[PDB]
Amino acid sequence: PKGVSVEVAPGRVKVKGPKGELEVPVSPEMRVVVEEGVVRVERPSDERRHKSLHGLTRTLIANAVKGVSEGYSKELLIKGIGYRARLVGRALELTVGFSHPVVVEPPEGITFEVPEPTRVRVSGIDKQKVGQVAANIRAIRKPSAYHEKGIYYAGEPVR
Template identity: 85%
Template sequence: MSRIGKMPIPLPKGVTVEVTPGLVRVKGPKGELSVPVSPEMKITVEDGVVRVERPSDDRRHRSLHGLTRTLIANAVKGVAEGYAKELLIKGIGYRARLVGRAVELSVGYSHPVVVEPPEGITFEVPEPTKIRVLGIDKQKVGQVAANLRAIKKPSAYHEKGIYYAGEPVRLKPGKAGAKK
């Protein structure tokens, strides 16, 4: 039995789940998400708890069991609390600023890079060297953060670029360090 798949998903106050074959709709105080799921999985909502059950111990059903439960749990957490990813900018003269809803990055190019947020995503710039990506869809928040990071990836030699908060960056020694 899948250890992740068999765990029940508790519903916080104000969150409702509507199950239709192949689709689960989750509504909460922060918004609404639709999660496509396999119609083979049995999803039940009772007593403020969502449970996912699989029809058999077939390999395909075992793999879908944990995945389905995790996707629904992520949607429930997203509409209740939301998700955030924090990015740090390191480098001399590197900074970010909010221009309307978009974020403008000055990261060593000849021009500033302006990134418009997709629908459902908001940016915050609490400091010129910090960017917060906020939203209710975990996958979309992570993808937008990855796209921002890809604009100027961290350099392993100079410790410059856009990092995830808490990301360990291993500096390479360069030419002088290789001679020793």
């Protein structure tokens, strides 16, 4: 957590960083020990349900910080014949197959650029929004279960 600003609250934890600051409401029944330049979490037992709540907010926070450290960037590949992307301003329009070319709305806290009409990045301070926004884009045109057309990740096709 270099250049961060971890803080304490009744039921949440704020994350100050170059990118910005995001609310991250964590578990109530834990410790949010903030040392000099390191952040830890302790659990008030060793129960079945406390193990889960410990490791959960032990990463979620490691992400709350990693959200304003270097920022996320979720790729999305486009394959096909007419299939090609196009950033119309801050929003992304694309032609995939349907009669009309659908336009993607800008979600708050997420600006998506483009390397190719075939490659599609998705920045985002929160890692929750980054994956949510990016899956919704795969939704529009889900992979050709017989060819190789539509939306993809860097995660192997279907064939």
